[PDB]
Amino acid sequence: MATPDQKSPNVLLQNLCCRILGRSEADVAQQFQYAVRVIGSNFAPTVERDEFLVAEKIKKELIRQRREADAALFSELHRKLHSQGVLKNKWSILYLLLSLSEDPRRQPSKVSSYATLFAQALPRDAHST
Amino acid sequence: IRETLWLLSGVKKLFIFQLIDGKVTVRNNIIVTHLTHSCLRSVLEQIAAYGQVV
Amino acid sequence: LWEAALTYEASKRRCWERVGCPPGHREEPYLTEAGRDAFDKFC
Amino acid sequence: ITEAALVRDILYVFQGIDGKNIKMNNTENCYKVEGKANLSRSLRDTAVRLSELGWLHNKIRRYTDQRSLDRSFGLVGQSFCAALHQELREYYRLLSVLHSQLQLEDDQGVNLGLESSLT
Amino acid sequence: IRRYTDQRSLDRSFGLVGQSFCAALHQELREYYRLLSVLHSQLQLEDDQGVNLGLESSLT
Amino acid sequence: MASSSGAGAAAAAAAANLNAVRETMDVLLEISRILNTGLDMETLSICVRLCEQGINPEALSSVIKELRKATEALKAAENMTS
Amino acid sequence: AGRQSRTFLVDPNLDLSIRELVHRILPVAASYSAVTRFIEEKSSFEYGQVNHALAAAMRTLVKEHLILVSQLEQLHRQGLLSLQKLWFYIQPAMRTMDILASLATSVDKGECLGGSTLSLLHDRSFSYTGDSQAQELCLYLTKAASAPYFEVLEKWIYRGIIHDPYSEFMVEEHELRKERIQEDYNDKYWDQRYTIVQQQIPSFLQKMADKILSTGKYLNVVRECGHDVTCPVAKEIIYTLKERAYVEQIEKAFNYASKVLLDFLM
Amino acid sequence: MIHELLLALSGYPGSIFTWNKRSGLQVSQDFPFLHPSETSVLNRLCRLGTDYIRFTEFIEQYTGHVQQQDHHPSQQGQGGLHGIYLRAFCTGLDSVLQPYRQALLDLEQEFLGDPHLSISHVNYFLDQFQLLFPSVMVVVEQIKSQKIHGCQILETVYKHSCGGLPPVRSALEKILAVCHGVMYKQLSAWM
């Protein structure tokens, strides 16, 4: 019977820390404080709210993992997500998922090289945020 | 679906499927939202043939 | 709150007469079959 | 000419089919955009670039269909046709995904100028 | 500065150290041009918005 | 060869319908002439559409007679006042 | 017109400042077109596997460029792209494309193939020693381009087999008549079975070429002696710019082959 | 429309998909809700659907009809499909069409699940059967034309079983396995 409503960052961070560490907020106070300090001064005006870049990055990663079929499945999932109007900040969700993604090959147990390319994305900084 | 099951259960006097000369016949003025009249008619004709046999 | 609401299950019943919300709408049987209270109402 | 019509034509070309405004020119063995004035020359060139891929697709599918029926091609020929069909199936799956995305974009009714718009 | 950069970017005889210096100069020039572009974008936003926004972006 | 079956059949059906409409209009014109009904092709098509829409032939005949009497009276009045 | 850079016509009624900015920016698109022409030309199988791999890497970079262009298109669709923002965003991409185009034009003018292509790549990488982004790009390109060349080197040193359809490796095999190899005073077996292609010697392998030659000669001798040699030191060869680890691996393989051959002879 | 399309593929022709005894299953007319290129693609799939319909018609012709008790059962196999080999052939055809029916039902369910799916998804999903079915249809037409009877039908199937298409190879292996089961039953009776 919960209706989506904007809850303070503290509540979300507390719940997140509890579930990640699997301990009470009292047992993660130091980590909570460190995370709070880092997070509390971080606004992303430089992130380009463009799902296409994230999707392309995901496809390239899957290809690197020899998972072209998984890339197609991911594309279909992204299409379905676009069909649904539940999420508003899809670029943010995709960026978060990709950043928190862990390569099953890193299938295998490691990944061949990390020659990060200049490809990357946009800086959006050009706008007067 | 329910009327089809009742026909296949051997129920007589269905509203859509009328039994004429021992032949189950579909009422002509029946339409379903998801089927064409001709397609529905063909499927119901196969079902009606089996119902007439029963 | 969105995540507590996420844990809600919904009916798998779909129909090809409905496309905008195919979450089911409970055909609700009728001819006897709606149970004792409906039979009492019918009586 | 709306971009959406170009999208439809491109989806057909991916199937090797001539669009309403883009038709296969057998003399050029390529799909040609109908000479309707409202096509941008840049858009025309882009359409030609895509139509080369559509022409190749249609040619490949014609070849596969023509040779798949020849029992005299032998087992190796049948296997080659089968491999071509498998790769074509993968391509068609991708094309289906793109087409479904365009169809979903049409279905949502919202002119979302989002990066998800079929450019 | 741009004339100097163009004059030295073409000189293979500048050697690896000279090329590295020119590259560093080009990187700093890119940063400067980025800053100039940001300022230009702010002024363009002020012109395009039509509002006399006394924001730091207004072209004074 | 696969793609052609829908549009070709649609075109053949349209041509057959046009020929059938022409034949029906000719038959109706012949019937009207034998009955001395006085209907033209355009009028015959309009009457056919009205009959297809369910108009009572007695109601239609009474309406037609009243409209014809009014039209004849208006033409006679225009010729008498000129 | 010919092997010239693509030229653009600007409407004469355009702003002079706009026209000059366009003339300054247009070079990136000219580089893109030239790169596409080079890719399409060198993409023929006749140009050898090294050139094919180079073209494939170029295609990957072209895909990345297209992605960038699509992102700029998206920004424009948002109306968020100004000419100054466009110039700023394209400046690094412009420089990368210009470096790539210069490398492509140098390779095309030199007709570099196989070891000559590797030498040209090495020289270009030294030419981009000052551009860390260009250096990274060249390093990626060199590592990719070494794959077929290092595969050929591995095959020669570990099996003594030349599988070179395009004759790109620094070692060339000549058919010496074995019948006269024992009879004729000339070491046709020793001298003609494996020959060094000086032009096909990679500059990064030039210092080890003689050791590579000896290794392949030894492997060929062992195969011609009827001794099947499984190289125990066979490892993937990776191009490296700072470390000559491949040189040390080649020396280890040479020593292994030398020991095996000495034991065989004794 | 997708439900109607599946019904036509399920053998229920409608107003959109007309069945012609000569042409088989065909799209009846141009629909106003389809792009002419979409109509062309749909009819291209309708070619496969027509082949399926013709296969089903053949199945009815060879299994759905009572075997005429012509005194000489050997000659019953010639004109009409009859014979134990004919029953096995019909059974194999129905078994091979069972996976196609299952795929069609799964497609119907999936399309019911997602209103944003297009016909292209079906065309992708059904392409394997769009390649499989034509070869089996050719084989069945050849069997009918040559009037293969009894175990001589088995020999022809074996010759056809040697085809190069791996999916066709597997299907013919299943059919051959069924025919060999029948043969083995007869051989058991004899031995």
3-state secondary structure string, B2-53? Answer: HHHHHHHCCCCCCCCEEEECCEEEECCCCCCCCCCHHHHHHHHHHHHHHHHH
3-state secondary structure of H21: coil
Interface list for chain H against chain C, based on CB atoms closer than 8 Å: 3, 112-113, 115
Q: How many CB atoms lie within 10 A of CB G83?
A: 16
Compute φ and ψ for H84, nearest 5 degrees. Answer: -70, -35
Q: Which of G82, G126, G127 has its CB closest to that of E44?
A: G82
**B touches H, CB cut-off 8 Å, minimum 3 pairs:** yes
Q: Is residue H123 within 8 angstroms of chain F, CB to CB?
A: no
Could you tell me which of G66, G95, G205, G194 has the C-alpha nearest to residue G145? G205
Q: Is residue D99 within 8 angstroms of chain H, CB to CB?
A: yes
The C-alpha of A50 sits at a distance from chain E's nearest C-alpha, in angstroms, of: 20
Q: Resolution in angstroms for this experimental structure?
A: 6.8
Q: DSSP character for G6?
A: P
**Torsion sign across C-alpha atoms E6, E9, E13, E19:** positive
In our burial notation (b when 16+ CB lie closer than 10 A, e otherwise), range A36-51 reads eeeeeeeeeeebbbbb
Could you tell me which of D89, D27, D21 has the C-alpha nearest to residue D50? D21
Residue type, E24: A
Could you tell me which of A88, F7, G217, G248 has the C-alpha nearest to residue H46? F7
Chain D residues with beta carbon closer than 8 angstroms to that of G74:
115, 119
CB contact under 8 A, C16 and H3: yes
Which helix (DSSP H) or strand (DSSP E) does residue H43 occupy?
A: helix H36-59
Distance of CA H66 to the CA centre of its chain: 20
Q: Please name the residue that has the structure tokens 């262009």.
A: G69
Q: Is residue C14 within 8 angstroms of chain H, CB to CB?
A: yes
Burial of residue G106 (CB within 10 Å: 0-12, 13-18, 19+) is: middle
**Rounded CA separation H152/H160 (Å):** 12
Q: Give yes or no for a contact between G133 and G92, defined as CB atoms under 8 angstroms apart.
A: yes
Q: Is residue B38 within 8 angstroms of chain C, CB to CB?
A: no
User: Which G residues, 46 through 75, put their C-beta within 8 Å of a C-beta on chain D?
Assistant: 70, 73-74
CB contact under 8 A, F6 and H23: no
Among G36, G76, G77, G81, pick the best mutation site for testing chain D contact (most D Cβ within 10 A): G77
Nearest CA in chain C to B3: C31
First to last CA, chain A: 37
**Torsion sign across C-alpha atoms G227, G232, G238, G242:** negative
Compute φ and ψ for B12, nearest 5 degrees. Answer: -95, 170
* H contact chains, 3+ CB pairs < 8 A: A, B, C, D, F
Could you tell me which of G72, G84, G107 has the C-alpha nearest to residue G25? G84
CA angle A34, A39, A45 (to 5 degrees): 155
**Rounded CA separation D102/H118 (Å):** 10
Could you tell me which of G164, G119, G162, G108 has the C-alpha nearest to residue G142? G119
Residue type, A129: T
Chain A residues with beta carbon closer than 8 angstroms to that of D97:
72, 75-76, 79
CB contact under 8 A, H164 and D74: yes
The C-alpha of D116 sits at a distance from chain G's nearest C-alpha, in angstroms, of: 9
**Rounded CA separation A79/A52 (Å):** 11
**Rounded CA separation D13/D22 (Å):** 9
Chain G residues with beta carbon closer than 8 angstroms to that of D50:
none
Distance of CA D91 to the CA centre of its chain: 10
Compute φ and ψ for G113, nearest 5 degrees. Answer: -140, 135
**Rounded CA separation B47/B6 (Å):** 12
Q: Which of H118, H138, H163 has its CB closest to that of D78?
A: H163
Q: Is residue D93 within 8 angstroms of chain H, CB to CB?
A: yes
Q: Two tokens at G162? A: 């030349």
Nearest CA in chain A to D118: A52
CB contact under 8 A, C14 and H112: yes
**Rounded CA separation B8/B4 (Å):** 6
Burial of residue H109 (CB within 10 Å: 0-12, 13-18, 19+) is: exposed
How was this structure obtained?
A: cryo-EM
In our burial notation (b when 16+ CB lie closer than 10 A, e otherwise), range H36-52 reads bbbbbbbbbbbbbbbbb
**Torsion sign across C-alpha atoms A98, A102, A104, A110:** positive
Nearest CA in chain D to G73: D119
* A contact chains, 3+ CB pairs < 8 A: C, D, E, G, H
**Rounded CA separation H164/H155 (Å):** 17
**Greatest CA separation for chain D:** 54
Interface list for chain G against chain A, based on CB atoms closer than 8 Å: 64, 67-68, 70-71, 74-75, 80, 82, 85, 88-89, 92, 96, 133, 136-137, 139-140, 143
Residues 6 or more apart whose CB falls under 8 angstroms from that of G63 comprise none
Among D34, D98, D100, pick the best mutation site for testing chain H contact (most H Cβ within 10 A): D100
3-state secondary structure of G239: coil
Chain H residues with beta carbon closer than 8 angstroms to that of C20:
115
Burial of residue G240 (CB within 10 Å: 0-12, 13-18, 19+) is: middle
**Rounded CA separation G136/A111 (Å):** 19
**Rounded CA separation D100/A76 (Å):** 9
For residue A121, the number of C-alpha atoms closer than 13 Å in the C-beta half-sphere is 18
* C contact chains, 3+ CB pairs < 8 A: A, B, H
Q: How many CB atoms lie within 10 A of CB E14?
A: 16
Q: Give yes or no for a contact between D96 and D113, defined as CB atoms under 8 angstroms apart.
A: no
Nearest CA in chain B to C19: B34
